[PDB]
């Protein structure tokens, strides 16, 4: 009944028209889970690697037939007859089967697919909500969403260096209202851009990449969008940024080259820069403010800004517990971006989140550029009472599907639902 | 056990960040269906009316709280105890409850949500695939995808008059390859646009709206994109257009005013235009080539081109059987765009498709601008062996969720799955 | 089936021959949970109040007939029909029914009994282990046991001021060996005491209260016992103390009066004392080292020792989140003793543990003086991966019933079971 | 469904911090029984022997790994597929498997573990109370408890020769009230001892071992405790003693050396002594009043005291039917102490009890020094309508767990429950 009778993969498509892995797990009694894997990286020295076929004459090298094959022909035979609820034991088996640090034999994408599909089949088998299967009875807290809204750096063709600007509706009483606020501000910003005669088409995360003149103009416009939606910047809505500073960091001279602003800064000057930005604009969180190897720099930024501003490691930590414990230990950051497919199992994902919490770090549950109709991360956010989530603009179903799943979960929790707004930032 | 114990609506969000209706249905035994409604029009003198709240201070007047209440407080009580497999009866009861021609009392969004939730719950109760529940044992033919790739007219800010340009992979052996072909052509097109220094952010349907100089610069660029993707334009890939000619049609003088083409043409000239467009480019299909009321021109259009070119009525028929029949009787068009939420029930949807078939017309199952993670239309297309579907670029999950469902359907069908390619056009 | 058909209380007896509450819960389908409540305090201005009958002629005023009636005649009728897996909702309903801050109307004993019986019935309904029902899939870490071994202060009639001395087997590879180490050290200690011609009858918690001459004669004797048991003091076994310093704290003069030590010290000197005690003996943890209101001294204590020594608040926080948070904000302590019956519901218990974790504080799951055959706290400790537990000497089934449950839990966990030893102290 | 699919043992801990056997039995349909074995003897010429590992470097030689191994690797394979309800057939198989008189190959502790776990699984499988599975429909009589209260001889360090003094609340209307009486007298005695400045810590059975001056002082103090609890010595509460006279018997000179009283007595003088004690104090029962081999002596004691006082053989009979039939036949004693683990199967235990009854002897169901959270003996007492039970002071859960189980059983029997007080002594 809980025993697995079938594990099955197929190739499907992600939100950007690229192949990805989908996995189905069935028990003897017909309990069913289906999971789809978001896009990752096939290389990267500290993260689980996704396996791609590399056949240039098929999906531009991005096929995942090998990965699908791995699930059907290597992983499946080992799982037949396993108790679908032994999540930890399943994850250890997957890790062992592969036998490498970065899951590069079977593929991070094969492994996560199975890891998630079993969890979903288990929750279906026990007939309980996924967030509750994952988290136990006390999973009840809806996250504050970091909603992508304006794009820069490598994600645009404009004069903005910051890669992303986001809004966080911290002043909402519940998640349902949080979402309406995000959505209204999004439609407000669209009208503001359209008035300036700027492009309002969208990128991967459902946000805009208009041709703004500078970082601060981007910030000013967003604040304007908020006011015109009828909300208060600061009190009701904070900003969040992903600087992706590795992208303008020069490894050669150890400095930051802001083409947008037309200046070159040291790590120390970057910290002065952020401090100024934060005093002018209601920014509550800054992601990858300094290069991924600028350990000395991150230490200074955290010392300077760590108690009034969330400091999120993305490329810094790469969802890697060795990196995380190094930051914790060296007073680096106070928050980690959690990408399930960058670590490769639900078990390892939950251990990572636990380590973050215990150090007083927030764990922000994250989308990837290539997403799918899967909403598992919404359930993960609630299972761990994480408090924050980053899954994009309130546009494109690859993003909005998560938001919808959070509405479902909040509705289902009814009067037990919580939403902590500004107080979700326990790191502050 | 097949009897309905609960019908439940909630407000969720579509792929454009606008609210829409989600409906859930349960039987006594726990059979379950969930449906989401795509974005229809609140007016339009001939199409079923979507009910919007119109509250200026909530979602910019686009809330669906009234429709959601209608489901929960009016429809639900009338459905408890109903055998969930009585789709026809259920649809009749919904229509009768509303009491109006255009479904404006309860809302077409409320009604369709219930109509689809019931069918999805029924397939679940019987434990058969939805396409099979909908169409019986012989549901087996995958649709040729009409994939949006470039936008103009009201859908863009360029010098292009045609509203949308689509590719149709008529030369693929199965849907899976059809889909790969579309994806590879889409990435090729993007590479090309990027080369010309044009914008590659996407619109509502997942396609590009670059600043192209002309209707034919658009067509030429798509041909080039196809060619560079490694496929034969004409033989393996055809083009389809949605002229949306209503937009540039001048009421006062009954002539057509193309800002982009920089001329003005009579109806007879439009046909001359299409004719020449068809002679220069591998265009297999044209949608709304003339005004949604210029019936006489449509009749000339069909006379001139109906034998070798598919002529689709979207705004012309409005998924309305009474309008379709007048089309059929007057020799107008050879194809109809089928929008479930434009009519309001699965029953009426299926009756329009049947009508179309008996007249030698193709029925193209269509998305809306605002979509969801819902993938019912993919099942509807296979259920009816329609042979064609229009659900977007292969980018954005609101579109790709439908393609993925078709992959699952094809995969389940196995050796019995069909794909007719160019032979899908039995109207030609 | 998950719906509750019966909630039933009876009066039973605790390990000290005092009445307490037993609650049973059944679902329609026969899912069953039974819980027994440990001994709390009838007053205490900040802790949930246990309801005692106070009848002079029945059990010396310690009957719980009123609480039992409250369960059977007030709570039960409100719970029939409730989905037994709605722990949060159930806990909320209990709290609301009582209507008071300190649970003094229905009784914390009545409320907790129902709260735990429901969770135990729920795990039974779903047929999953209780720790898993409580904590979700990732519940897997066995606690390092803090085992009572020698008593003083109000808990003895000797010249010892410290209320209790405990051993912690930090050097064991798993819980089973941890437990063996504690047992062997306990028999060794007994052999030693017996050699000195001292008494070896046990107290409420299963430990010895021999007539020792001094705080340090106690510590030295434990070290000797460890040494003679074949283990390394410091490396493999640490010591923990419950100072219960409130007891010898002189209100009138705000100084501390140690009858046994034969001196009187200021707060600054207490810290000096602990500091020196820590320098001479392998003490890893101190509980209630200063008065339950001498917040300022606690703050000095934490300043002086918090970095390398665990500082537990028992009477200081009273398992009260509002008190814990003031501790956290004021840099007071790095650990909290968690007593389920001091707060009154599993929901509130779990929220206090979560709060503690996010601040880098350890949460020690604790017994009461009066225990039962009930072993829920062992499941709670694993459910939360707390890393530590305080449930007594390895003698007396009221204590050993919890150790045995941990052995069963470890055994069930198999290869996925963890034990972190000295690394359990993430607060250090 | 009733067939055994799994028999499983593990090492757990008893109430004194010593290893013991725990056994779990599962049927094909999930019926479940868990039994824990109380401490026994690994040697003794007429009793089943418990198997201990004797590894001096592990639990001081008291491990039971061999015994656990015997269950898992030798006993389990033979029981798979057995009808769990064939108690007699299971017990015969266990006895045969071992093949020795005293169960010393497999261990008395392995065998009893299985024997009891099957019975519990069988009662669970049939969904009936254990006492009812064991005893049939007419099991309804709650026993009078012999509650340990004051300790002497080898169980103390005082001037008392008698090993134990107990109270029996014969005047209570039911068991629930019996227990409250015991408990109040226990708390009363504690205050009395505390007033004399005597130690009130507890030993193995939960009773006190204060430094009293003589046997008769012990008796006088207990009578005082009773009066001060507000009950009548004699009418409402009788005393019971376990002399354990083998402990002061000198095999060499055939006499009894009462160091406490500072006198030496012949068997005949011991009988005069008891007679005097009984005429001064409301003693109703005397256990092992003479040495285990003093057959001639026991005959005289029984002749003298057998019709007004219960005379219990413990070491005399050692739960051995050959010893019992020898006593019955030679007019020795009128009562036998029944220890399940000293005989080794439920079948043999019930046959022993039957033989006692048929001879007009009472069978007193007994605890051991090392106990556990197991309460099977409470159910045995009720299954056989034994009328008396000896499981310790109303303190320590190792004892109180039995008392609690008796409350549960009495509550469940409701109006069919009986309690015979003084009339339980059918031997008198």
């Amino acid at each position: 009944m809980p025993y697995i009778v079938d594990v099955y993969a197929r190739e499907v498509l992600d939100s950007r028209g690229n192949p990805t892995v989908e996995v189905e797990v069935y028990t003897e009694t017909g309990a069913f889970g289906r999971a789809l894997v978001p896009s990752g990286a096939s290389t990267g020295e500290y993260e689980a690697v996704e396996l791609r076929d590399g056949d240039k004459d098929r999906y531009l090298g991005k096929g995942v037939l090998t990965a699908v094959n791995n699930v059907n022909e290597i992983i499946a035979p080992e799982l037949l007859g396993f108790d679908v609820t032994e999540q930890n034991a399943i994850d250890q088996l997957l890790i062992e089967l592969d036998g490498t640090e970065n899951k590069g034999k079977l593929g991070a994408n094969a492994i996560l697919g199975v890891s998630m599909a079993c969890a979903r089949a288990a929750a279906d088998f026990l007939q309980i909500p996924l967030y509750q299967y994952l988290g136990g009875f006390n999973s009840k807290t809806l996250p504050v969403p970091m909603m992508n809204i304006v794009n820069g750096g490598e994600h645009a063709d404009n004069n903005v260096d910051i890669q992303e600007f986001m809004i966080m509706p911290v002043g909402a009483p519940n998640f349902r209202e949080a979402l309406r606020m995000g959505a209204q501000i999004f439609h407000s910003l669209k009208s503001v851009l359209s008035a300036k005669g700027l492009n309002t088409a969208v990128g991967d995360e459902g946000g805009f990449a208009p041709n703004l003149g500078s970082n601060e103009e981007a910030l000013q416009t967003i604040v304007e969008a908020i006011e015109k939606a009828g909300f208060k910047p600061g009190e009701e809505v904070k900003l969040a940024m992903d600087a992706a500073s590795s992208e303008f960091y020069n490894k050669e001279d150890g400095k930051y080259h802001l083409s947008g602003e037309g200046v070159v800064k040291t790590s120390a000057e970057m910290v002065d820069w952020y401090e100024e930005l934060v005093s002018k604009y209601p920014i509550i969180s800054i992601e990858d403010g300094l290069d991924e190897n600028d350990w000395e720099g991150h230490k200074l930024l955290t010392e300077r800004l760590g108690k009034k501003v969330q400091l999120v490691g993305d490329d810094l930590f790469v969802t890697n517990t060795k990196k995380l414990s190094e930051g914790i230990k060296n007073g680096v950051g106070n928050s980690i971006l959690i990408k399930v497919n960058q670590i490769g199992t639900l078990t390892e994902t939950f251990d990572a989140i636990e380590m973050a919490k215990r150090a007083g770090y927030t764990a922000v549950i994250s989308h990837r550029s290539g997403e799918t109709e899967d909403s598992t991360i919404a359930d993960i956010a609630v299972a761990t009472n994480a408090g924050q989530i980053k899954t994009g603009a309130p546009s494109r179903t690859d993003r909005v599907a998560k938001y919808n799943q959070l509405l479902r979960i909040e509705d289902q929790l009814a009067e037990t639902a919580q939403y902590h707004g500004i107080n979700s930032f326990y790191n502050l």
Side-chain angles (χ1 to χ4, degrees), chain A:
Chain A
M1 209 180 189
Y3 305 102
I4 293 162
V5 297
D6 193 39
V7 181
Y8 175 76
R10 61 166 62 89
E11 195 184 51
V12 295
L13 229 52
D14 71 17
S15 61
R16 311 160 80 197
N18 295 309
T20 193
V21 181
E22 174 174 299
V23 169
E24 293 181 348
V25 170
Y26 299 82
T27 70
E28 296 185 352
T29 189
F32 173 79
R34 172 185 293 139
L36 291 71
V37 182
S39 74
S42 41
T43 73
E45 69 174 305
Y46 292 97
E47 53 199 300
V49 286
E50 65 174 17
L51 187 54
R52 303 273 173 181
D53 299 337
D55 176 352
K56 358 79 73 166
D57 296 325
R58 191 174 181 284
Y59 278 113
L60 312 185
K62 285 150 179 174
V64 293
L65 296 175
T66 309
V68 166
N69 249 324
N70 285 341
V71 170
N72 295 328
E73 298 155 338
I74 303 187
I75 292 175
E78 309 296 323
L79 279 175
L80 262 41
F82 237 87
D83 186 321
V84 74
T85 67
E86 293 176 6
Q87 181 67 35
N88 285 333
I90 288 152
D91 287 335
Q92 173 188 334
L93 180 160
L94 296 171
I95 289 165
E96 269 165 9
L97 251 193
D98 172 284
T100 72
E101 270 279 332
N102 58 24
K103 302 182 176 55
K105 182 212 209 89
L106 301 175
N109 47 352
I111 291 157
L112 186 59
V114 173
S115 182
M116 303 204 292
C118 294
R120 301 186 64 96
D124 184 54
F125 169 78
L126 291 166
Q127 283 295 318
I128 53 163
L130 183 58
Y131 57 88
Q132 190 184 130
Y133 174 69
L134 294 180
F137 81 92
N138 206 41
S139 322
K140 64 204 170 180
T141 307
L142 280 61
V144 181
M146 279 184 179
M147 324 196 43
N148 172 279
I149 193 181
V150 171
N151 296 273
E154 294 298 292
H155 290 179
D157 194 34
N158 56 18
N159 209 43
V160 180
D161 306 290
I162 300 292
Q163 193 165 275
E164 318 170 30
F165 293 90
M166 297 166 274
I167 49 174
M168 303 186 73
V170 293
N174 51 40
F175 175 82
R176 187 173 178 206
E177 285 290 294
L179 188 73
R180 175 180 72 86
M181 284 167 65
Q184 290 181 23
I185 293 157
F186 178 82
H187 298 130
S188 177
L189 176 69
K190 189 179 203 166
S191 297
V192 162
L193 294 171
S194 181
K196 304 191 185 313
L198 299 186
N199 185 292
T200 56
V202 307
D204 297 348
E205 313 88 337
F208 308 118
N211 201 30
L212 294 162
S214 77
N215 298 120
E216 275 191 62
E217 175 180 329
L219 290 165
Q220 290 169 11
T221 301
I222 297 163
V223 164
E224 182 179 335
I226 294 169
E227 284 161 354
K228 289 185 177 168
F231 302 105
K232 314 166 182 290
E235 180 182 334
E236 289 172 342
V237 187
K238 303 279 203 220
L239 302 181
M241 304 185 307
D242 176 5
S245 64
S246 301
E247 298 304 323
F248 51 81
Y249 180 74
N250 193 112
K251 193 183 290 176
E252 200 94 338
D253 62 37
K255 298 184 185 184
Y256 300 85
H257 296 239
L258 281 44
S259 78
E261 237 97 6
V263 309
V264 169
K265 298 186 187 283
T266 60
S267 317
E269 285 167 344
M270 292 293 296
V271 175
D272 294 334
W273 192 46
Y274 290 128
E275 195 168 7
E276 183 171 3
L277 291 173
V278 161
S279 81
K280 281 190 200 182
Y281 307 99
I283 295 152
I284 191 46
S285 176
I286 296 173
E287 169 176 323
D288 282 344
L290 285 174
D291 179 76
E292 71 207 1
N293 302 290
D294 193 352
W295 288 95
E296 180 174 61
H298 279 109
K299 186 158 181 46
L300 183 70
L301 179 67
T302 301
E303 290 177 335
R304 298 270 296 275
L305 255 26
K307 285 135 167 296
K308 71 172 70 80
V309 170
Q310 180 160 264
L311 298 170
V312 183
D314 174 33
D315 291 331
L316 180 65
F317 294 143
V318 77
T319 322
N320 182 116
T321 53
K322 293 184 204 319
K323 289 274 181 184
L324 209 213
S325 61
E326 227 210 326
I328 288 167
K329 170 186 176 308
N330 294 295
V332 163
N334 61 25
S335 182
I336 172 168
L337 194 71
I338 303 286
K339 301 167 179 190
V340 281
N341 83 129
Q342 197 167 51
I343 191 68
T345 64
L346 286 187
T347 286
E348 296 168 285
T349 297
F350 276 61
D351 282 345
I353 291 171
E354 188 67 7
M355 169 166 140
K357 286 180 176 196
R358 275 167 196 207
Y361 284 46
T362 58
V364 182
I365 317 306
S366 181
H367 60 1
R368 306 299 306 264
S369 293
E371 279 292 337
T372 73
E373 52 273 38
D374 191 280
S375 62
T376 297
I377 68 184
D379 286 87
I380 294 174
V382 175
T384 65
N385 294 308
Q388 296 172 243
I389 185 166
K390 187 180 96 174
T391 21
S395 104
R396 300 174 69 108
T397 294
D398 30 293
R399 317 302 138 169
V400 173
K402 282 61 161 181
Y403 295 138
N404 283 344
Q405 181 60 14
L406 290 166
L407 295 174
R408 294 189 195 98
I409 296 174
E410 177 172 75
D411 194 28
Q412 176 172 49
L413 293 165
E415 301 179 353
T416 77
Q418 300 183 185
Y419 179 85
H420 296 159
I422 198 53
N423 296 315
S424 315
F425 291 90
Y426 59 80
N427 48 349
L428 300 182

